[PDB]
Every structure is written in structure tokens, then in C-alpha cells.
Amino acid sequence: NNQKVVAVLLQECKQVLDQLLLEAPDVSEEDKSEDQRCRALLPSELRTLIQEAKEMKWPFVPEKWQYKQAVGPEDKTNLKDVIGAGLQQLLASLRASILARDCAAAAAIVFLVDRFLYGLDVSGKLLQVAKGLHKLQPATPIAPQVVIRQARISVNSGKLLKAEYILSSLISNNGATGTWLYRNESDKVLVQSVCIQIRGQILQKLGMWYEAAELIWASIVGYLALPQPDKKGLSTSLGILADIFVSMSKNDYEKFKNNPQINLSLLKEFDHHLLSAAEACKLAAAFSAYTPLFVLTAVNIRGTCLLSYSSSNDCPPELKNLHLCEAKEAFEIGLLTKRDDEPVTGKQELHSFVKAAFGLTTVHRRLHGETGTVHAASQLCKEAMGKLYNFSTSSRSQDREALSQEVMSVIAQVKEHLQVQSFSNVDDRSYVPESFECRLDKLIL
């Protein structure tokens, strides 16, 4: 599960597809047998997911908690774990399906690993494999999630018009793409809603804060328009909306707030853009209570907003301590997203943990001045930042594992020196306090 290894394997798959383009179809019984074998040795859950993806059951691979309201223990997991555990074998089955010229199945595996590989910043090579599949057998259906993935890397690269042709093609034509078949009409609205969200991100990249916020609101409406509302998308859009609220000026936020078409409770309940942002982050963390990373990012932004507002001249002195305590709670939740000592992978998650440490130390400095524990916690924070940037710059996998473990050890030490106490929740699988009520009805007035 390394970027370089996976990237090289995807390159090999692409080379195989090119060679098959030069060769005439002659699938040997060995090829078919190794295809069936490689798929059969995968765990049952992944075989089911592969068959469902191949059958075009959904345009996105869903999470068990994403569409269910009456959630339970079997729903409170994330596919990152099962996919990450069988990634090597999923790629072996991908190569095997390519050699068997079963491009529909190979595309199904591409669909399955798409999200995890985006986390590894290797979506380009994966999309090269998809293009080779389409070159061999043009009728091979490609999931809208993968097309949108192309849009995503194009936005991340600054190719805004290129991404916008993809997004606009999906939006203006009811999500139609290639030879993909929707089983119901609502999945089209879902694809449209993700594309509209990405339009919001494009306008955010351009600093058109008001219109970006409007598009994000539209994506929220679309997520609510589904038979089962998309809680994951709502969490994402609430976070993006929070960042936009932070970047907005006060006149931007006032113009957005005075638009009656936008029936957001937080828009009419708060008058300061940082407080609206903090509330939007609270809701975003509530809506992804079983995915600790997004809870951590959301509460990080929340704590930053409350820290910034508490020091503002717009904050009444009676509430300064209350908002500082709210920021303290937020950063505490963020640090509590990691329990006991499980490894932490990814520069983003690590960076978010150090961000939570800096936030909590800053809040303590605001509450108790320059105490000794603020100095010790500050030293631990700077150490964690040093090992963090060493991690980000290192190319040796073992150094990255070691620096990650050390950085998390430091994080645990700031947790001890600052007395972060676990919160009470009747849902031991949830990463948010009960105060963070997951209520979709309160989003709307």
C-alpha cells in the first residue's frame, strides 16, 4: 500500500493493455483460470462488491453508513479498511482480468480501488488503465465516479475548463456517460450533485466566494433530494461551505445571509461568518461520526474559527470564555479521533493531528496565559511539526512509518500534558460527543 509500488503496478497494467492492443485476442485457458482463481481468493465482501460494481448497481461505491439512518454496528465501518487490506490482491485480480480480456470486470476493480488510489495520489495511472480498457473494448462501462475522478485531478492541476467540460457534460445531460446504465433516476441526481459540489470547489479556487457558497448550497439540496440522502456528501459540502465562509468578507457573508432562497438554519441563527463556519463544521463532523479523519478536519476548522472569533473585537467579553471552551472541545475531539496506538497513514491525517495539537495549545495559552504546561506542550508541538515535515519530505517508507509513529507518540504526550478526557457517548463507535447531534432536519428552517 505504497504510492510508488501501486503506481508501478498500474503502469505495468497499462503496458499490458497496450500490448493486447497489438495482439489478436487469444485468451488461453490458463488466463481464464488465473482470473477466476485471483477473484475467488478475495474475501467474500470484495467479491460481492466486484459483482455489484460490474453490474452497475451504483455510480459511486457506497459506504455502509452513508445512506442508512437507523445505523448499527455492521454499518459503522469504512471501505478504506477492507480495500486497503486486500489492495495487493485486488490489483493482482485486476491484472488477471486484463489478461483474460474481461474489461468489464477489470473496470469494476478500477471502480472499487478508485477512492483508495485517489488517497495515494495515483489516480492518473489508474485512469490510464481505464483508458486502455476503453481502447480494447469500447463498450466497457466506466463508473461516473471514475470520470469525475478525472475532473478532480484536472481541478487539482489547474485545468479548470477541462474539468468543467466533464462536470458540465454530466450536469447538463442528467449524468449520462459512456455505456453506463443507471438503475434508478435518483443516482443521476446524485452524480449531478457531486459535480455541482466540484463546481463550488472550482469557484472557491477562483475566489468567487459568494457564487461558490451558492453552488455548495445547491449540492446540499441535491444530496437531500435523494431517496436516501447522502450523509457523506452533506458532510463534505458543509466543510467546503465552512472554508468558504472563512474566506468570505463580512459583506460577502451578509449578502449570502440576506438571500431568502437559502433555507439554512445556520445562516439565520448566526450573524458572524466565523460562527456560521464553526456550526457548519460541527454538523459536518456529526454527519461523518464514524470516519475519524473527516471528523478531525471538521473539528480542526471549527476550533480555528472559535479561536479566531474569541480574540476578535466582535466577540462580547461574556462569551469569550465560552467560545474558547468550544474551541477546546473541538481540538480535544480531533485528538481523540485516534485511540490507543493504531498506525496513522497519510500526510493529511498526520498534519491534521499536529494541527489539533497546535490548536489546543493555543487555546490553553489563551485561557491560562504562558504557563509551564503551555511551554511544554508548545515544545512537543514544535517537535511534532519537525518530525511531520521530515515525514512529508522523506521518500523512504520505513522512515515514514517511524516518523509517523513518533509524531503520534508526541501527540499522545500533548494529550497527556493537557488532560484531554474521553467524552461520554452511548455509541462507542461514534467519534463525536452526543452534543454533536446528527439531525438533518435542523439544517433547514
Ligand X SMILES: Nc1ncnc2c1ncn2[C@@H]1O[C@H](COP(=O)(O)OP(=O)(O)O[C@@H]2O[C@H]([C@@H](O)CO)[C@@H](O)[C@H](O)[C@@H]2O)[C@@H](O)[C@H]1O
Residues that bind ligand X (CB under 6 A): 60, 115, 118, 145, 148, 194, 197, 230, 232-233, 235-236, 239, 284, 288, 294, 297
Give 53 or 380: the residue with its C-beta nearer to ligand X: 53
* Distance (Å) of CA 215 to CA 27, 62, 161, 256, 301: 49, 23, 17, 12, 21
User: Smallest distance, Å, CB 236 to ligand X?
Assistant: 4
* 115 marked among binding-site residues: yes
User: Under 8 Å CB-to-CB from 68, ≥6 apart: which residues?
Assistant: 75, 228
Nearest approach in angstroms of CB 311 to ligand X is 26
CB of 341 to ligand X, least distance (A): 23
Backbone angles phi, psi at 227, to 5 degrees: -50, -45
Q: Is 287 annotated in some ligand binding site?
A: no
* 151 belongs to an annotated ligand binding site: yes
State yes or no: 152 annotated in a binding site.
yes
Enter the DSSP assignment of 264: B
Task: Tell the smallest beta-carbon distance from residue 353 to ligand X (Å).
Answer: 15
Amino acid at 163: A
The residue (of 7 and 224) whose beta carbon lies closer to ligand X is 224
List Cα–Cα distances, 153 to 132, 146, 228, 251, 265, in angstroms.
18, 11, 28, 32, 33
- 34, 115 Cβ separation under 8 angstroms: no
In the complex, the smallest distance separating the C-beta of residue 288 from ligand X, rounded to whole angstroms, is 4
140 is in an annotated binding site: no
Do the annotations mark residue 60 as ligand-binding?
Answer: yes
Q: Which is closer to ligand X, CB of 283 or CB of 380?
A: 283
Nearest approach, Cβ of residue 130 and ligand X (Å): 14
The response to whether 236 counts as a known ligand-binding position is yes
CA distance 245 to 252: 9
What is the crossing angle of helices 103-119 and 144-156, to 10°?
Answer: 40
Residue nearest to ligand X (CB): 233
Whether 189 and 167 have beta carbons less than 8 Å apart is answered as no
Q: Identity (one letter) of the amino acid at 113? A: V
Q: Which is nearer to ligand X, 115 or 135 (CB)?
A: 115
Is 250 marked as binding a ligand?
no
Which cell numbers in the block locate residue 312? Answer: 476578535
Secondary structure letter of residue 58 according to DSSP: -
Minimum CB separation of residue 330 from ligand X in Å reads 15
Element (H, E) at 227: none
CB of 165 or CB of 250, closer to ligand X: 165
Nearer to ligand X, 102 or 243 (CB): 243
Helix, strand or coil, per DSSP, at residue 261: coil
Nearest partner of 270 among 247, 250, 285, judged by Cα: 250
Is there a binding annotation on residue 230? yes
CB of 304 to ligand X, least distance (A): 15
Angle between helices 160-172 and 186-205 (to 10 degrees): 150
**391 labeled part of a ligand binding site:** no
| Contact residues for 323 (Cβ-Cβ < 8 A; gap 6+) | 306, 309, 310, 315
Looking at beta carbons only, is 177 or 197 nearer to ligand X? Answer: 197
Nearer CB in complex with ligand X: 132/233: 233
Could you give the CA distance from residue 84 to residue 74 in angstroms, rounded to a whole number? 18
The annotation places the binding site for ADP-D-glycero-beta-D-manno-heptose at 60, 66, 115, 149-152, 230, 232, 235-236, 294
Binding residues: 60, 66, 115, 149-152, 230, 232, 235-236, 294
